[PDB]
Design a protein around this ligand. Sequence first.
Ligand SMILES: C/C=C(/C)C(=O)O[C@H]1C(C)=C2[C@H]([C@@H]1OC(=O)CCCCCCC)[C@@](C)(OC(C)=O)C[C@H](OC(=O)CCC)[C@@]1(O)[C@H]2OC(=O)[C@@]1(C)O
Ligand SMILES: [K+]
Ligand SMILES: [Mg+2]
Length: 994
Amino acid sequence: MEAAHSKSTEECLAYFGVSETTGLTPDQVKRHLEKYGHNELPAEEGKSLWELVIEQFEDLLVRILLLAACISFVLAWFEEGEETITAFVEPFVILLILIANAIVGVWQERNAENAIEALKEYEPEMGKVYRADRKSVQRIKARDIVPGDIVEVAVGDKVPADIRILSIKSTTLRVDQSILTGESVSVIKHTEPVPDPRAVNQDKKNMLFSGTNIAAGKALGIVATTGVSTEIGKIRDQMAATEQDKTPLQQKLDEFGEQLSKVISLICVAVWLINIGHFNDPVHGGSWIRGAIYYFKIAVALAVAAIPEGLPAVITTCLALGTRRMAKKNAIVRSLPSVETLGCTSVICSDKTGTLTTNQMSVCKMFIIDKVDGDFCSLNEFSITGSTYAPEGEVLKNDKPIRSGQFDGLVELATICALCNDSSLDFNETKGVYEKVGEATETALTTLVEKMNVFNTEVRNLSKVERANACNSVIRQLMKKEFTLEFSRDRKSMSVYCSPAKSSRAAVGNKMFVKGAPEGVIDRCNYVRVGTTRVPMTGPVKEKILSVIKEWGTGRDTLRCLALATRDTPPKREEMVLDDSSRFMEYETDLTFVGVVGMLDPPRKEVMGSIQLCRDAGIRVIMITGDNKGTAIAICRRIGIFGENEEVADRAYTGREFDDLPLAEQREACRRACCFARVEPSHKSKIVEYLQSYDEITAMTGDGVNDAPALKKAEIGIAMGSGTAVAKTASEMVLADDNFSTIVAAVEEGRAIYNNMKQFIRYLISSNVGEVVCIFLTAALGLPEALIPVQLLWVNLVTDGLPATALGFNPPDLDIMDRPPRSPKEPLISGWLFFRYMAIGGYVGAATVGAAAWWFMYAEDGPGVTYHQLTHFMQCTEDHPHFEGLDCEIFEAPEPMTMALSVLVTIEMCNALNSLSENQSLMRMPPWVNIWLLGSICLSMSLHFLILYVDPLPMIFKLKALDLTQWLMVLKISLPVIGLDEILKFIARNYLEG
Ligand SMILES: C/C=C(/C)C(=O)O[C@H]1C(C)=C2[C@H]([C@@H]1OC(=O)CCCCCCC)[C@@](C)(OC(C)=O)C[C@H](OC(=O)CCC)[C@@]1(O)[C@H]2OC(=O)[C@@]1(C)O
Ligand SMILES: [K+]
Ligand SMILES: [Mg+2]
């Protein structure tokens, strides 16, 4: 029964055909179970260990690599491991990488945490029902509860289903429902219907929501909805229906892999068509099986050359280290790839209280009526110092300090503040500061009362722990608080009914003290207090009171205002019914205005600057607040979201205004809006959707489980460190200190990170371009393998992987927050840069094949063949008494492969430095600029020598070291690559726009 809050207790009982005394019959439970299912959210999504690894191998590059391993493996068993038992080495290495990458997947997944699963923490194991088969109450499993059940809850109970309250057995029922409504304090429940079928949850005063807690009391209810139909259930389903898109880099890599298969596929065909002459060859006289093995030794080399096998390790280690750095700056990143999206944020939607502001409220201003005499009216306005909750401060009139007691209107103002107040103070000895007990707003009032000391209590001789509530306590001993009419939002006030306590001075009698939003309260005043006198409420006095309130709330003060008032002749006690807040407005009529208080919830100190950084970085900032629209706007002005004199008619909206627009104009509103006041959790999600319709990258804050769907949906959901576990698990990032400026500092890192990622991605991939060239020339010409997969893998995982991660530590651009957000569709390599790596790749694939061949042709220690057809090396076995007077195993020699492997290594070290900066020459941007980069390069070079010199490894790698001179040639060949990009860098700077 979705609409139970709007129905009476009788109607709900009749809807289900259940007695409040008996509960459901066993039959009814049977039938209700079948119709409505069990009371629980669905079991976790479907992914198993066997399934996990299949997903690890859906990847296109991973798929190609796997295949490569197989061909490698055949080559092993069908080539003599008796000539070289270092042949079964190649197929093995490949497989291993694939295992690591799949183990990466399962460790990451098994340690991941689903937000929908965090919801289930709000499901109690048990619940209590009355059912017909037994007279006394039954403790049963909560999942066995069914709609129509007569349920019982009490102090400490987590509420098992969405329940329409029937009967409150205790004198009062208080509920902690902060997780659903973000109401900080426990709230009173009642039993009467709530008229509006479209009432938001905060106004369903007669409902208990599944997952919340009973803070006090005891009550009997009827279950309205269960399982997926509850409020927390609807939230689960929104989340589950939310597909989170791939990060831009993820997309670009899938793009790469897609295209990389296509290219590789093309290259294979290419190979075979300059070697199409193999068809004009005689059927007999050729070892085909050696020719076919040749196109497969080259096939596996190709797959290995093209794939940046070390890239996922480098990407993840840079993000990891960025993350550690972010966490020292209060930004706790939950999703490693989020760092990139974070740097892309173009819109930040942020809650105000506690993140743009301190949520540390104090009363800064107050006024009472000084005099009313015709059209003449005079106020007494005061100011109050001290911004903390401490009793430290003074009251000032026209900047002069005054004694509050001297003003009759103020002793009454204080007593209203002291009594119309469910909050208090307490002094903490551990932290050494005063702290709030209750709402921030009301606690500001009890602080105000302490500063006013309106009876001049011997306060000087008072200790701190008792100083906290000292002045308040002498007011609480003057009137007896009989009962209180709790705040509700239909009337936006609350009141307390007091009788005179024992009085030495016989009072007028009972009083009601009320405080609330000024408009409503003031309208219900027929009198204004002037000192101890009372005068009828007139126009000039009203306008004067309201004009000041507007000033304080709407100007640079940005103060939240409460009107304070008392009812001098309340209804007779016996004529009041306290079980239905519907009547409380009527009880709070015919009041006398006594004063207004203005309190401030100040911006965090850093928030000013951050809003300006966002302006500088072209990031829109959207405030979401509970303030009225006029004060929301003013607060925006105060923190720089709006200029002080900027016209913001079309950039500010209330939930009410926003809903009243047709869908088209809701969307246009989101294009420019920077302030939403008094919204519904509904709206956060809608706002995100709209912003995504402008292809925005939206960060969005939240902290309750009611925020969870918007967090899930935003590109970056941002949770509060002090918020719910559920909100955190739905977020890409948690703010350890709740501070908005932490968002902005994380966006900065995200940009710095990605820029450095750009460089080592560009670098590794450009190397793979190169390798693919070498492998291509090997096959295209018909040379002995210049490079082997065993070697190429080593280069791609290790020797290039260290400068790659070193480029992760490229110092950041100083203007990195003076540029607009990066387009998510920005290609990593395109246009002109494409040409640059097109050229560099063409170089290294020639350098590597060259040195290998230079060992063969134009040789000092090689066959020394000057310009011979050592492209026909394969047919040297039978054709040696035909052509060669020389040997033939010289074509499987290590030294050519290690000439190639050495020029590859040396080249990439140089190209790492060309990669320190995209276009800045090492003229203006030296290589010492990256401290760690120069360091890492020297380490890989060691590792080069290690596979050249340490007794086990050379045979494994088909390598043999080269003496004092053969390196000169390695350097002759490989060193120039610097001069190439240094030129192409010069070009971009001076000729194309940039
Ligand atoms: C890695 C090895 C190379 C050989 C490769 O195939 O990558 C290609 C391809 C996949 C693209 C190209 C490569 O194409 C070429 O290199 C031209 C053909 C040369 C053939 C080689 C032998 C004849 C990238 C590598 O070329 C340059 C010149 O660097 C740049 C870029 O890659 C990126 O932007 C990096 C993405 C993380 C992509 O054009 C990319 O596809 C597009 O979707 C992008 C945007 O991805
Ligand atoms: K999200
Ligand atoms: Mg919230």
